[PDB]
Amino acid sequence: HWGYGKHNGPEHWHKDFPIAKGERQSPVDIDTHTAKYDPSLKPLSVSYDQATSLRILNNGHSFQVTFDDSQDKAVLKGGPLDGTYRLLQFHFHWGSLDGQGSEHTVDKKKYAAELHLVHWNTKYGDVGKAVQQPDGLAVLGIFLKVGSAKPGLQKVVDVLDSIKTEGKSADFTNFDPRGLLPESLDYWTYPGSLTTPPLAECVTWIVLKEPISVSSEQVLKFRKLNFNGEGEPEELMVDNWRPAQPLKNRQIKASFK
Ligand SMILES: [Zn+2]
């Protein structure tokens, strides 16, 4: 079954999911000098004031904070998007060391980690239907670098002890994802895919230019998580990132000059 190791990692995924070699796969390298400023792009609208978090969960490939998406509470709109996208969950990708971990790269630069806030288009009714559409999902990608602590992340970090292994989950209510956003909403955008199986080509990517800083102690707690279930040989959940994929016939647009 798929993972990030030598024998089941990204280089193997195409066997079960042939779309892995498709025309709009993610992540990609963002070449900042080739990305064109698009004055027709709208500002991003990130409306998270009424977000209702539910649970935090180790799913064997990341940890995930899930939200109540049964109403328009926390929504993404504007930017390159048409219509309304509901926040379902967020998760992270990170490295074994600070010099790798992000999925997107910027001029080949790898960040220590990458946050993905996953939203689905309300015109398709549920996320299962949305992932079967070219404009079904919008994922907001935020880079993490190591420096000063991110206060808004600490409540997440402090509960990771309770979900060490695959399949563990905990109540995680009243978490405010606004505390994970950088100051600027300047972004790059391109059409792409889920970066984990099934790798469905259903995502409008919105990747913020400004990283957030997290502390070494915060990211160290990420690295104590396990891929494995309880009672199995301990394998640290680290380097759970897919590398950059061919850009092919796509253009990355910038919201900023
Ligand atoms: Zn992700």
From Swiss-Prot:
Changing residue 61 to A: Reduced CO(2) hydrase activity, rescued by 4-methylimidazole (4-MI). Reduced proton transfer. Enhanced proton transfer. Enhanced proton transfer capacity. The modification Phosphoserine is found at residues 162, 169. One of its GO terms (cellular component) is apical part of cell. Its EC number is 4.2.1.1, 4.2.1.69. Changing residue 91 to C/D/E/N/Q: Strongly reduced CO(2) hydrase and p-nitrophenyl acetate esterase activities, impaired stability of zinc binding. It comes from Homo sapiens. This is Carbonic anhydrase 2. Its main location: cytoplasm.
